[PDB]
Design a binder for this molecule. Structure first.
Ligand SMILES: [Zn+2]
Lengths: 105, 116, 48, 48
């Protein structure tokens, strides 16, 4: 009793809105289940087999994407300037963090 | 003497599609994916609603709601009547046998601090 | 002669005797849950 | 050194398990103890 949506649909040649109107938006829809399918692909678990490893990659690619979009002619975005300032300050901070410990010796 | 109602809740064995190699156990709730521990937006709400039971009523404040700390644990009556008719799946038997043990054991270290 | 050798010999041998005795006394017990074979133990190892 | 490492891992894992899952007690024991009584009885108590 109280079946899920995956035993309900059984057909996947359609658009999302049709299925919405046919299974979840009908007045007679019993809607008596909540079960989120596992969407991670095995072709990705076999290489990143750890939530920490799946999060480090998910953050590295996020940083890459945020670098690529900010690097017709508007160019007047505060986020590009913020990323530039952050990169410059990070470079200048690591600069005075290796030399400072070179001096202390 | 027994504290609040947040440290006595039943199982609520909803479901999970994640392998046991990943799932973690947040106290007070069931067993969820591991990604729910690196997200403070959840691991700071599911943990504050627990310790909001150990806190006595003389320490919630001065105008905090009669029965509970409304600023943390309050659901409108419409939302309570709406989530009442929400029903999760049911855990598989071979999976509910150890899930209930993990749940009621990760909670014992709280019903044990409330006594010491 | 001194009473050292036949005392330290016993004191040393008793440890290994007890270890080999505990290794074989538990094999004959009630329900054994030997987990040296791992068909489905990786999940419960990584979770814990 | 590789044995000291495994012993340290076992001890710290047992401590953290006693701290997290308060249900268990986990008396970390050794089989070399428990010398025998009057005759053929060893009475190994619970533990790991
Ligand atoms: Zn912008």
């Amino acid at each position: 009793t109280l079946r899920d949506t995956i035993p309900d649909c059984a057909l996947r040649s359609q658009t999302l809105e049709s299925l919405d109107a046919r299974y979840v938006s009908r007045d007679g829809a019993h809607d008596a289940a909540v079960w989120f399918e596992d969407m991670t692909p095995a072709e990705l678990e076999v290489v990143f087999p750890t939530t920490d490893a799946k999060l480090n990659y998910l953050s590295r690619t996020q940083r890459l994407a945020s670098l690529l979009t900010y690097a017709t002619p508007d160019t007047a975005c505060v986020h590009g300037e913020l990323l530039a300032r952050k990169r410059e300050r990070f470079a200048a901070v690591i600069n005075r963090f290796l030399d400072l410990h070179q001096i202390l010796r | 003497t027994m504290g609040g109602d947040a440290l006595r809740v039943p199982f609520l064995d909803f479901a999970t599609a994640t392998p046991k190699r990943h799932q973690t156990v947040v106290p007070g709730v069931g067993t969820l994916h591991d990604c729910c521990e690196h997200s403070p937006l959840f691991s700071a709400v599911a943990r504050r609603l627990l310790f909001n039971s150990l806190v006595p009523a003389q320490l919630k404040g001065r105008d905090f709601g009669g029965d509970h700390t409304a600023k943390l644990e309050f659901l409108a009556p419409e939302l309570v009547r709406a989530v009442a008719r929400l029903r999760f799946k049911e855990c598989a038997p071979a999976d509910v046998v150890p899930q209930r043990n993990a749940y009621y054991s990760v909670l014992n270290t709280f019903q044990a601090l409330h006594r010491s | 002669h001194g009473e050292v050798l036949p005392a330290t010999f016993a004191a040393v041998a008793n440890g290994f005797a007890a270890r080999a005795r505990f290794c074989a006394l538990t094999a004959g017990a009630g329900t054994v849950i030997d987990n040296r074979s791992a068909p489905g133990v990786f999940d419960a190892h990584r979770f814990m | 050194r590789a044995a000291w490492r495994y012993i340290r891992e076992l001890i710290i894992a047992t401590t953290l398990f006693a701290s997290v899952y308060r249900c268990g007690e986990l008396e970390l024991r050794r089989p070399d103890c428990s010398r025998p009584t009057s005759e053929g009885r060893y009475r190994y108590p619970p533990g790991v």
